[PDB]
Every structure is written in C-alpha cells, then in structure tokens.
Amino acid sequence: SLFELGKMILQETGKNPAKSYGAYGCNCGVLGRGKPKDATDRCCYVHKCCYKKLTGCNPKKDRYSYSWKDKTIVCGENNPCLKELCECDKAVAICLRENLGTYNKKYRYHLKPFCKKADDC
Amino acid sequence: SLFELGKMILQETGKNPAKSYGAYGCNCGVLGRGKPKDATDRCCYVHKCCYKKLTGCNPKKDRYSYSWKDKTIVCGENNPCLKELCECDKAVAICLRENLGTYNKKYRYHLKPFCKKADDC
Ligand SMILES: Cc1c(C)c2c(c(C)c1O)CC[C@](C)(CCC[C@@H](C)CCC[C@@H](C)CCCC(C)C)O2
Ligand SMILES: Cc1c(C)c2c(c(C)c1O)CC[C@](C)(CCC[C@@H](C)CCC[C@@H](C)CCCC(C)C)O2
C-alpha cells in the first residue's frame, strides 16, 4: 500500500516522500502517466506501469510485509501479487534515490498541460 | 476525479491544490484518515468520510461535470454517485477556503505515520 511505498521512499532517498515526490513531473504523485520529464519522473512512470501489471491485489490498498536488512528493502511476501507489488515499490524507491543527482525542483508541482502523452506500458 | 477535486480547491482557495493540500495534516492526501491536526485537516477528514458513502464510482479517477456559476461550484446532474462525489469535492473545497486563515504550513507534508488513528466515520 501507499504506506509501505512512502516508507520505502523515505528509507531509500532520505526525503519526505510527499514533499519530494507527491507531485513531481508527469508521473510522480499525479494522476496517470505522461512522458517523463527526467529520470526521477521516469522512475514513477516505470512504477505505474509496474502496477498496471499486477493482478490479484490492490496496489494502493493492500498492505504487505517487508523488512530493512543490511540497509536493503527486503520484501517479505510469497503471494505473487503482493510480492510483485512490494517489488514494484522497492524498485521505485531505489530508482528515486538513484536519480536524486538529477532531481530538479522545478518539476515539483509540474503543470499537467505541459505533459506529453506517455508511451504505453 | 482528482482533476475536478483539484480544480475546485484551486477555485475556492486560490491555492495550488497539490502543494497546499496534496499532503497536509493527517487527512489531506493519501493514506486514509487520522485524528485531524486543525480545521483545514478536519475538512479533509469529513471529505474522506464523504467518499466512504459513495457507491458505484471511483472518487480518484472518475471524472464528472460541474460548472462555475456566479463563482459557485455547481455540480452537473452526472449520475447519483458522481453527483454525490462532486458534492463531496465541492464541500471540501469550500471548507478549505473557509479555514484558509488558520492554514499552517507546518502541517504540509506531515508524516502520515505520526497521526493518531481516526475514529470511524
Ligand atoms: C495512487 C498513487 C500515489 C498517491 C503515488 C504513486 C503511485 C504509483 C500511485 O498509484 C507514486 C509516488 C507518490 C506521491 C509518492 C508519495 C509516497 C506516499 C505513499 C507516501 C506516504 C509516506 C509514509 C507512508 C512514510 C512515513 C515514515 C516516517 C518514519 C517518517 O505516490
Ligand atoms: C491516492 C489519493 C491522493 C493522491 C489524494 C487523495 C485521495 C482520497 C487518494 O486516495 C485526496 C486529496 C489529495 C490531497 C488531492 C488534492 C489535489 C489534486 C486533486 C490536484 C489537482 C490538480 C490541479 C492543479 C488542477 C487545476 C485546474 C487547471 C485547469 C488549471 O490527493
């Protein structure tokens, strides 16, 4: 669920998730997808596409277990959907962290009209 | 959907909805409800409870029609659920405007996992 995703994002990036990613670019936080403005935004795009792939669980609502071991997010599920869901969240948290180097505040609260259509997943 | 909700908030409050209300207190934003931090937050609390009563439509993604007449949000007939949804959104937008005076930027990006459990609606 969003609770685990937000925690992973904090864990990986060290940043308040809503502040840095609640509305960033065309894919982070915003509703729907759009052509990514940069790497951080692409992480969110990949994430939404990852969610689109799930079957059997609600990405927003379903809780799942995971742990922090050797400073790594370790999913703790066997159910295919919760496992994949957890893995989707883990990937976006890592990706956001990995792209902090090009994170650009000008994309915070990016206006949707400036977003081009996303390639489909 | 979030588009309409955001537009209403912008219309009533004059503020960028994502920035001011995308994540505020324990109730404005993702992650259900929590004991409200202040009046602004209380608006979002009532708003989430309002959504609970909806049957047949998705508050997040289902778009609907409304008009700005005499500077008032006027919900389109749409269908029962969408009309109720529109009324839920209109109410929260009005409520946020009425309480703009006590908006506290300290609650923007409030960490959801530092909210007491909300009472049931
Ligand atoms: C519906 C939906 C939303 C809302 C969205 C994204 C996607 C793919 C969605 O389908 C991606 C990014 C973003 C805004 C990012 C924000 C992450 C939130 C889940 C964060 C909530 C954070 C809390 C729990 C962690 C607190 C930890 C304490 C120790 C401080 O969330
Ligand atoms: C997953 C999820 C999210 C992310 C969420 C909420 C709920 C119940 C959810 O289950 C409620 C409130 C908010 C806090 C939404 C507040 C703002 C948005 C609706 C922004 C809309 C965009 C605005 C600029 C549009 C302006 C109109 C243009 C014509 C200029 O975010």
From Swiss-Prot, chains A, B:
GO BP field: arachidonate secretion; lipid catabolic process; negative regulation of T cell proliferation; phospholipid metabolic process
GO molecular-function terms, A-Z: calcium ion binding; calcium-dependent phospholipase A2 activity; phospholipid binding; toxin activity
PROSITE patterns the UniProt entry points to: PA2_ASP, PA2_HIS
Region listing for Important for membrane-damaging activities in eukaryotes and bacteria, in residue ranges: 105-117
Tissue: Expressed by the venom gland.
One Pfam assignment: Phospholip_A2_1
One Gene Ontology cellular component annotation held by this UniProt entry: extracellular region
UniProt key word Secreted: yes
Cysteine pairs bridged by disulfides in the record: C26-C115, C28-C44, C43-C95, C49-C121, C50-C88, C57-C81, C75-C86
Cited CDD domains: PLA2c (cd00125)
Keywords: Disulfide bond, Myotoxin, Secreted, Toxin
Entry keyword Nucleotide-binding: no
Cellular location(s): Secreted
Main localization category: secreted
Function description: Snake venom phospholipase A2 (PLA2) homolog that lacks enzymatic activity. Shows myotoxic activity and edema-inducing activities in vivo. A model of myotoxic mechanism has been proposed: an apo Lys49-PLA2 is activated by the entrance of a hydrophobic molecule (e.g. fatty acid) at the hydrophobic channel of the protein leading to a reorientation of a monomer.
Assembly, per entry: Homodimer; non-covalently linked.
Family, per entry: Belongs to the phospholipase A2 family. Group II subfamily. K49 sub-subfamily.
Name of the protein described by the UniProt record: Basic phospholipase A2 homolog piratoxin-2
UniProt source species: Bothrops pirajai (Piraja's lancehead)
Source organism phylogeny: Eukaryota, Metazoa, Chordata, Craniata, Vertebrata
